[PDB]
Amino acid sequence: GVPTYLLPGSGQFLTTDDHSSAPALPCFNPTPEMHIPGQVRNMLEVVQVE
Amino acid sequence: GVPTYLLPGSGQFLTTDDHSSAPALPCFNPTPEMHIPGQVRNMLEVVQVESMMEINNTESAVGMERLKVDISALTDVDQLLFNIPLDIQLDGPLRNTLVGNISRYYTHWSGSLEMTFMFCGSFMAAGKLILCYTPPGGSCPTTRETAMLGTHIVWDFGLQSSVTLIIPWISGSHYRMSTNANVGYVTCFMQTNLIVPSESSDTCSLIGFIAAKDDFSLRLMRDSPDIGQLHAAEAAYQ
Amino acid sequence: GVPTYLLPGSGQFLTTDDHSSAPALPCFNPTPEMHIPGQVRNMLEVVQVESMMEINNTESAVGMERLKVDISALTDVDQLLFNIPLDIQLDGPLRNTLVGNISRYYTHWSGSLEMTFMFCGSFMAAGKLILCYTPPGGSCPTTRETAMLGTHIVWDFGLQSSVTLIIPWISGSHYRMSTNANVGYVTCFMQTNLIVPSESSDTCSLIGFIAAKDDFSLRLMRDSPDIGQLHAAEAAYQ
Amino acid sequence: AIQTRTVINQHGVSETLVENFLSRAALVSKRSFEYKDDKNFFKWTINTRSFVQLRRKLELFTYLRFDAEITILTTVAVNGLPDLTLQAMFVPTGALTPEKQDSFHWQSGSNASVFFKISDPPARITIPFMCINSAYSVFYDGFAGFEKNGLYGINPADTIGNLCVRIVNEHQPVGFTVTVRVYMKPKHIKAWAPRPPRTLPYMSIANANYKG
Amino acid sequence: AIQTRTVINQHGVSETLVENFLSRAALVSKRSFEYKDDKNFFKWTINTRSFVQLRRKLELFTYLRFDAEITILTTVAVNGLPDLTLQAMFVPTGALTPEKQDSFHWQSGSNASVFFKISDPPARITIPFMCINSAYSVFYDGFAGFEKNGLYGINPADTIGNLCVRIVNEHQPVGFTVTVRVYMKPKHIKAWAPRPPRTLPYMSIANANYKG
Amino acid sequence: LQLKLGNSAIVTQEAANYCCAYGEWPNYLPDHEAVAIDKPTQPETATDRFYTLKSVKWETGSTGWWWKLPDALNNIGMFGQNVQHHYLYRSGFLIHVQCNATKFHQGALLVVAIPEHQRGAHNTNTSPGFDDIMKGEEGGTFNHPYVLDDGTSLACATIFPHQWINLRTNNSATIVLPWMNAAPMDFPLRHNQWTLAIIPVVPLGTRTTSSMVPITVSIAPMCCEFNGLR
């Protein structure tokens, strides 16, 4: 097997973590993306409007 | 060693996970695969097979009576024979079909359907029917003249025993926040009388079929509501 | 570090797992391998060796008497000598053999077998036997004439002391939901009388052998039912 | 009731794959047994006909070839909670099933035993395709035997085996209740010859009798 | 009884490999011992002849060369459960076996000790091929010595060693029972000169006497 | 066109198109699947012929008919003699169903071949016995054809290999059945691979209250093997 050891911070839930999780429903294909007008990619695009 | 840390979701049993497990018996070679006829790889292959509709939309009709609509002298000019609400979910002609049963395993369905009506009178029985299609939103016709104003088929069954009609795109779903209800109708009216010779039977019957087409699709698998829950249950434990 | 999560089945001890473990003594060099004669790499190498059948199918025969069938003047014309039910599992001539014992470690077996009968009379003892093969399903013959109508060997043992016969494909299994039972028979009848000179013994004996062939196969290893369970047991603890 | 509708945007056939249609971990068995040292241990003949909704899904086919991914999810409740070792032993056809908690069949060198604790993740093993034939007969138009009610619909080559679960621990002064939930996920599924769905309620486990 | 039959579709020789025929984790020892601070600890001379079914499988051969994968599965029961450290110490031939729980032989710098808790997965080590010869003598047509009952069938080069298991913890106000199950899986197996199976029941562990 | 097979021949004038069940034509057991009983023997003709059953009377109150294969043939001719002497078999089937009606009769038949039609009984917990299943050449009658006597539906029975006989358009039906089993050989006296069901979806009719149509079933074993015996 693989010799492992747990670090400090193992088993914690940080609310800002960036980890993939288990898909609850894989084999579910979501509705495909459609072009909707006015896509926001940056909140500074909003702030530059008078 | 390897420095590791456990994630949120460690040690959980999700019932939809895709992880290999320990083989309980490796070095066991299973029985090899043999070619068996009729392999199913997709449940849409099942749904594209025609199956009989309960086009007799009358209650007190039970069993074999529900699969056929009788026409006779009791059917007049301009007379309504059957009305098929295009509902996979609800109780109607499409409920006990292969396209009704397999689609109740899924939440969202989508696609064209394929009706086929077969006249099963005698060889010399003649007459005309108006098979209508009413789209979703539209009102079902109540007269033969309103029927002819829509999308329709003037079907002479005197020589052509079978007629088929593409149903363009019904596509209902399931809602909890409530049904789809009215998504379309197939309606039949008597254009003429039934004309039979005096040695053929007075009464002649129609049967209907429904299949899905290749554009038909199903999504978000659920539990089918059809059979719910018996004998010799606790025999597999003693 | 490495983001990890534990699976269902973590921390279990499956008795059939295939995982390396910690060496208790590394830097210990074991004794090197020496060539020893007769290495077994496959248990089917054991099963393909002939071993004596208990062809004496009579009870009250014990020990050495069971391995031989006597023929004499007490054996008449058209007289049944032995009947070998082709059952590896059940009590019969094939139970205490190398093909019977090793196959009871497995659940499903399959393949051809190899019978050999050796006449062990005197040099001038003469006579004929009909060694029959009855396939599975078929009834065992009770007369010498029904015996000759099947697959058979008219064996003159006056000069040929050994005869061998391929058993085509018995292949039984184990069932719990019940046995295989009848899967075939090897049956022997007296075609002639035993003809011995007046200085040879009146009584002459046959012995039988069974081996498996190269198409023989075993599957789904289990515990053998043969020996169950004593003295000086708790000496390995004190 | 209120009636609604939505424009449905779908494309693709992948969710109606028979692998996707059938491979989910379904609850196939659930028993309680008390423990104070087939009573006092879990024994279950591994079938697919205990619950009617997995039964109706699999009876959409005539033949099925699959491996079974068995997950065993044991919870305890006293009559806190001690950490107990459980043995789950898959007893195939041709092996001998235990009848006691302390029987010698639990010492099986040849049966697949898994030893696991309550505090662990749930025990999970894959039972292979165990049949003598190429597929399991979901339906069987035949008899298991001919001698005086060898029953109809029973195939001798359909028996997976038994799933026997006990508590490896000995008797304790506390008494407690062990609930064993068994979850099966069929894997590597091939299916043949699809059938009409059952429209009437099941009456028995062993057959296809109908009340109407 | 009911009698059945199935068309059997088999091909291959891989399951009757002697590695596959013999490498399974078999229960080779099981003892209870009480604890209140060879009584009060587990000591087992590592043989293969404790249980008759592994004995009859290995006595299908004359010579065996294998590594032993020892798994130790300890359960506790009080007379909840505290988490206790156990020491399992493999004492080879030539080392000295403990006779007490608190003996100085448990402090062995040279014996392979494994320290493990109850809450852990079961302790697992691989004892190597320990023999002075190239194979273990399953049978030995000789004597261990010549001076006044140096016993028959005993080979001085067959001794694996002892598996000594104690509780590293000290005495507690609670009294409890420790059951030590030892599982052995032979590994990297070579076998030589196959033998007839035993047909009669065993009478003793130390010999091949038969009652008939 | 004649269906000529052996010393049997079905000599008709009209027969349009067969149904090939699951698209599979019956072939002999291939030389990689026969690891079993060595070289399963083939009479090649002696069984492979039409066995024309006793005709059934279709009337207005007919619920339908069924024959189980090979149980319908296990006591008929050289097929049924080989069933009693052999232990294993493998066969496909050619089934020809024919109606004798005039142009004044009406009615539709679903002629459906069901693989492993395990039957249920009605309003009981006991399984069907031996005499409720193994009817032989006479066959059985559907008690509840709407559920196919197994709790399912007749409406969805076109998922199986099937043919329609609508007496306007046709009076005959041909289904070609391959070998349908999870094993390559099987045991003909105690397991059935196919059930030929003939069910009137639209009942029979003419005016004079006693309308009656002959239905004739001709079953030919195709590629019929058996174990060696020598």
- In degrees and rounded to multiples of 5, residue A40 shows phi and psi of -100, 125
CATH at residue B234: 2.60.120.20
Q: How far apart are CA C25 and CA C134, in angstroms?
A: 59
Yes or no, beta carbons of D113 and C15 under 8 Å apart = yes
Q: Min CA distance, D99 vs chain F (Å)? A: 28
Contacts of B153 (CB under 8 A, 6+ apart): B129, B130, B131, B132, B163, B165
Helix (H) or strand (E) holding D19: helix D18-22
Q: How far apart are CA F52 and CA F67, in angstroms?
A: 12
User: Chain E contacts of F36, Cβ < 8 Å?
Assistant: 7-9
Nearest Cβ partner for C1 among A1, A7, A19: A7
Q: Residue D150 in contact with residue F127, Cβ under 8 Å?
A: no
Q: Residue E73 in contact with residue E86, Cβ under 8 Å?
A: no
Q: How far apart are CA F99 and CA F165, in angstroms?
A: 8
Within 10 angstroms of residue E108's Cβ, the number of other Cβ atoms is 17
Q: How many structural domains comprise chain E?
A: 1
Chain A 7-36, CB below 8 Å of chain D: which residues?
27-29, 31-32, 34
Subunits next to E (3 or more Cβ pairs <8 Å) are B, C, D, F
Beta bridge partners of B85: B185
Count of alpha carbons within 13 Å of E125, Cβ hemisphere only? 20
Within 10 angstroms of residue B131's Cβ, the number of other Cβ atoms is 24
Chain C 110-169, CB below 8 Å of chain E: which residues?
110, 136
CA distances from E105 to E41, E72, E89, E110, F164 (A): 13, 20, 10, 10, 88
Q: How far apart are CA C232 and CA D5, in angstroms?
A: 82
Strands (E), E24-84: 26-35, 42-45, 63-78
Count of alpha carbons within 13 Å of E110, Cβ hemisphere only? 9
Three-state secondary-structure class, residue F140 = strand
Label residue D181 left, alpha or beta by phi (over 0 means left) and psi (-120 to 50 means alpha). beta
Strands (E), E60-193: 63-78, 85-92, 112-117, 123-127, 136-137, 161-167, 176-192
Q: How far apart are CA E116 and CA E85, in angstroms?
A: 5
Q: How far apart are CA B67 and CA B56, in angstroms?
A: 6
Residues F223, F159, F95: CA angle, nearest 5 degrees: 30
Nearest Cβ partner for F87 among C112, C136, C151: C136
Contacts of E147 (CB under 8 A, 6+ apart): none
Put simply, whether D101 touches C (Cβ < 8 Å) is no
Q: Residue F69 in contact with residue F149, Cβ under 8 Å?
A: no
Q: How many structural domains comprise chain F?
A: 1
Put simply, whether F228 touches C (Cβ < 8 Å) is yes
Nearest Cβ partner for B6 among C4, C16, C220: C4
Paired tokens of D4:
């609604």
Contacts of D122 (CB under 8 A, 6+ apart): B13, C8, C9, D71, D72, D73, D74, D183
Q: How far apart are CA F227 and CA F230, in angstroms?
A: 9
Paired tokens of E107:
């402090």
Label the pairing between strands C185-190 and C106-110.
unpaired
Stated length of chain B: 238
Q: How far apart are CA D183 and CA D29, in angstroms?
A: 7
Q: How far apart are CA E88 and CA A50, in angstroms?
A: 77
Reference C122, options C208, C207, C199, C209; nearest CA is C199
Q: How far apart are CA F140 and CA F123, in angstroms?
A: 19
Yes or no, beta carbons of A19 and C1 under 8 Å apart = no
Q: Residue E39 in contact with residue E33, Cβ under 8 Å?
A: yes
Yes or no, beta carbons of E7 and D133 under 8 Å apart = yes
Paired tokens of D106:
């639990």
Q: How far apart are CA F154 and CA F148, in angstroms?
A: 6
Rg (CA), chain E: 20
Q: How far apart are CA E83 and CA E79, in angstroms?
A: 16
Chains E and A touch (3+ CB pairs under 8 A): no
Q: Residue E7 in contact with residue D132, Cβ under 8 Å?
A: yes
Q: H-type helices in chain A, by residue range?
A: 44-47
Q: How far apart are CA E202 and CA E209, in angstroms?
A: 7
| Cis peptide leading into residue F70 (ω within 30°) | yes
Paired tokens of E123:
């302790």
Q: H-type helices in E30-178, by residue range?
A: 52-58
Yes or no, beta carbons of B6 and C8 under 8 Å apart = no
Beta bridge partners of D167: D86
Stated length of chain A: 50
Residue-wise DSSP of chain B: -EEEEEPTTTT---TT-----EESSTTPPPPPP---SSEESBTHHHHTS-EE------TT--GGGGG-EEESTTS-TT-EEEEEE--SSSSSTTTTSHHHHGGGGEEEEE--EEEEEEE-S-TT-B-EEEEEEEPTTSPPP-SHHHHHTSEEEEEETTT--EEEEEE-----------B---S-EEEEEESS--B--TTS-S-EEEEEEEEE-TT-EEEEE---SSS---BT-GGGT-
Contacts of F214 (CB under 8 A, 6+ apart): F55, F56, F57, F58, F99, F100
- Burial of residue D20 (CB within 10 Å: 0-12, 13-18, 19+) is middle
Query: Resolution in angstroms, to 1 decimal, for this deposition?
Result: 2.7
Yes or no, beta carbons of B28 and E15 under 8 Å apart = yes
Q: How far apart are CA F122 and CA A14, in angstroms?
A: 61
Q: How far apart are CA A9 and CA B5, in angstroms?
A: 7
Residue holding tokens 């789950």?
A: D88
- Burial of residue C8 (CB within 10 Å: 0-12, 13-18, 19+) is buried
Residues D178, D183, D188: CA angle, nearest 5 degrees: 155
Contacts of C170 (CB under 8 A, 6+ apart): C86, C88, C111, C113, C136, C183, C184
Residues B162, B167, B170: CA angle, nearest 5 degrees: 150
Chains A and F touch (3+ CB pairs under 8 A): no
Q: How far apart are CA F114 and CA F135, in angstroms?
A: 16
Paired tokens of E168:
């590293």
- In degrees and rounded to multiples of 5, residue C55 shows phi and psi of -75, -15
Reference D69, options D211, D183, D150, D157; nearest CA is D183
Within 10 angstroms of residue C87's Cβ, the number of other Cβ atoms is 21
Contacts of A3 (CB under 8 A, 6+ apart): B1, B2
Q: Min CA distance, D18 vs chain B (Å)? A: 5
Interface test with B, best of F60, F103, F156, F170 (most B CBs within 10 A): F156
Domain with D111 in it: 1-212
Reference F98, options F53, F138, F59, F63; nearest CA is F53
Helix (H) or strand (E) holding D22: helix D18-22
Chain D nearest-CA residue for E10:
D132
Q: How far apart are CA F135 and CA F120, in angstroms?
A: 15
Q: Residue B150 in contact with residue B141, Cβ under 8 Å?
A: yes
Chain breaks in chain B (C to N over 2.5 A) after: 177, 229
DSSP state of D71: E
Q: How far apart are CA E201 and CA B237, in angstroms?
A: 34
Nearest Cβ partner for D15 among A27, A32, A34: A27
- What dihedral angle (degrees, nearest 10) is formed by the CA atoms of D89, D93, D95, D98? 50
Q: How far apart are CA C34 and CA F22, in angstroms?
A: 61
Three-state secondary-structure class, residue C238 = coil
Domain with B177 in it: 1-238
Rg (CA), chain D: 20
For chain F, the 3-state helix, strand and coil shares in percent, each to the nearest 5, are 10, 35, 55
| The amino acid at B81 | L
Q: Residue B195 in contact with residue B125, Cβ under 8 Å?
A: yes
User: Chain A contacts of D187, Cβ < 8 Å?
Assistant: none
Yes or no, beta carbons of C176 and D117 under 8 Å apart = no
Q: Residue E207 in contact with residue E139, Cβ under 8 Å?
A: no
Q: How many structural domains comprise chain C?
A: 1
Q: Residue B194 in contact with residue B204, Cβ under 8 Å?
A: yes
Domain with F170 in it: 1-230
CA distances from F70 to B35, B207, F65, F191 (A): 21, 32, 16, 8
Which residues of F have a CB under 8 Å from any CB of D?
22, 68, 115-130, 133, 144, 147-148, 150-153, 155-157, 159-160, 180-183, 187, 189-193, 195
Nearest Cβ partner for F118 among D133, D145, D153: D153
CATH at residue D80: 2.60.120.20
Q: Residue D40 in contact with residue D101, Cβ under 8 Å?
A: yes
Yes or no, beta carbons of D71 and C8 under 8 Å apart = yes
